[PDB]
Amino acid sequence: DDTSSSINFLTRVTGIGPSAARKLVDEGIKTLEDLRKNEDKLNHHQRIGLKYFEDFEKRIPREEMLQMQDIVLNEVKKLDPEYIATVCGSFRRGAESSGDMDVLLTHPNFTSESSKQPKLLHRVVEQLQKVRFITDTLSKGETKFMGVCQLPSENEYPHRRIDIRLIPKDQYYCGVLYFTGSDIFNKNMRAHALEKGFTINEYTIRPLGVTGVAGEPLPVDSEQDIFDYIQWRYREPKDRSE
Ligand SMILES: [Mn+2]
After folding, report:
1. Binding site for Mg(2+): residue ranges?
2. Cα angle vertex 136, ends 117, 42, to 5°?
3. Which parts of the sequence bind a 2'-deoxyribonucleoside 5'-triphosphate?
4. How far is the CA of 85 from the centre of ligand 1 (A)?
5. End-to-end CA distance of the chain
6. Three-state DSSP class for 82?
7. Residues marked as binding for a 2'-deoxyribonucleoside 5'-triphosphate?
C-alpha cells in the first residue's frame, strides 16, 4: 500500500536494504526527514547514503568522469608506478554519462597467492583523501573500498560514489573485462568460450575436459589474451554492447 510505498522509498538509500528497510518501518521510520531525526539507528554506511541521497541520484557526465579518471590515475602513479589502475564500467565502454566510479587496481607484488596486502589498497585511498578527492567512506575492506568523492571545486560538484577493488595481478584482466561488461557481452563471450572448450569467470579462464567439470587457469597478461584463447578477434571496449 501507500506504506509499502515507504519500504520502497527507504530502500532508495545506499545502505538501506529490505530487511534493513523493513525494521525501520516497524520503528515508525518512513519518510526521509524521519531518517534525519534518526541517524542513531543507522549504520555508518546508511548514514552516508542518507547524507548524500540527492547527489547520489545524479548521473556522472563523461566530462566529469574524465577528470575523475585523471586524478585517480595520476595519484596512483606518484605512489608507485608499478601500480595498475583501470576505470571500468560503461564509461570504459565510451558511455556518455555514468552512474559511479569503478576503479580496478593491481600490483605485481600482489597475487592470488599472497592474499593479504591491505596496505596496498589503503595507501591509495589515503593518498586520495589527502588530495581531497575521496570525501567519505561507506565501507572499507582489505580488498575493496566503497566511498564518496568529489571534483575539486574552484569556486560545486556533486558527490559521487566510487569504488576500488584490489585484484591479484594474475586475475586482473579477467577482471577488467568482467567489470567492463556489458552483461550481454559477457554472457555471449562466456557462451562462445564454452564452445571453444573454455570456462570463463571474472577471475580466470580455464580449459574444460571430459564430463565437463574441469580447469587450471591460463595465464593472462592482458584482455587480448582472453580473446586469443578463444580465438575471437579482439573487441575494443566500445564494440562491447553485445
Ligand atoms: Mn560500482
Report:
1. 100, 102, 163
2. 105
3. 59, 90, 93, 99-100
4. 15
5. 39
6. coil
7. 59, 90, 93, 99-100
Would you kindly state where each structural domain of the chain is located, as residue ranges? Answer: 1-58, 59-172, 173-241
Task: Answer yes or no: CATH 3.40.50.150 is held by domain 59-172.
Answer: no
Q: What is the CB neighbour count within 10 angstroms for residue 164?
A: 24
Distance 42 CA to ligand 1 centre (A): 22
Say how many CA atoms lie within 13 Å of 79 toward its Cβ.
Answer: 23
Show the CA angle centred on residue 138, arms to residues 20 and 33, nearest 5°: 55
Q: How many DSSP H helices and E strands does the chain contain?
A: 10, 9
State in Å: Cα 101 to ligand 1 middle: 6
User: Which amino acids are annotated as binding site, given as ranges?
Assistant: 11, 13, 16, 59, 90, 93, 99-100, 102, 163
Q: Is there a contact between 149 and 159 (Cβ–Cβ < 8 Å)?
A: yes
Q: In the PDB record, what is the listed experimental method?
A: X-ray
Which class in CATH covers the domain with range 1-58? mainly alpha
Tracing cell 579518471 back to the chain, one arrives at 69
Distance 59 CA to ligand 1 centre (A): 13
**At the fourth CATH level, which superfamily is domain 173-241?**
DNA polymerase, thumb domain (3.30.210.10)
Report how far ligand 1's centroid is from the alpha carbon of 186 (Å). Answer: 17
> Residues within the annotated binding site for K(+)?
11, 13, 16
* Interval between CA 98 and ligand 1 midpoint (Å): 10
207 in Cβ contact with 216 (< 8 Å): yes
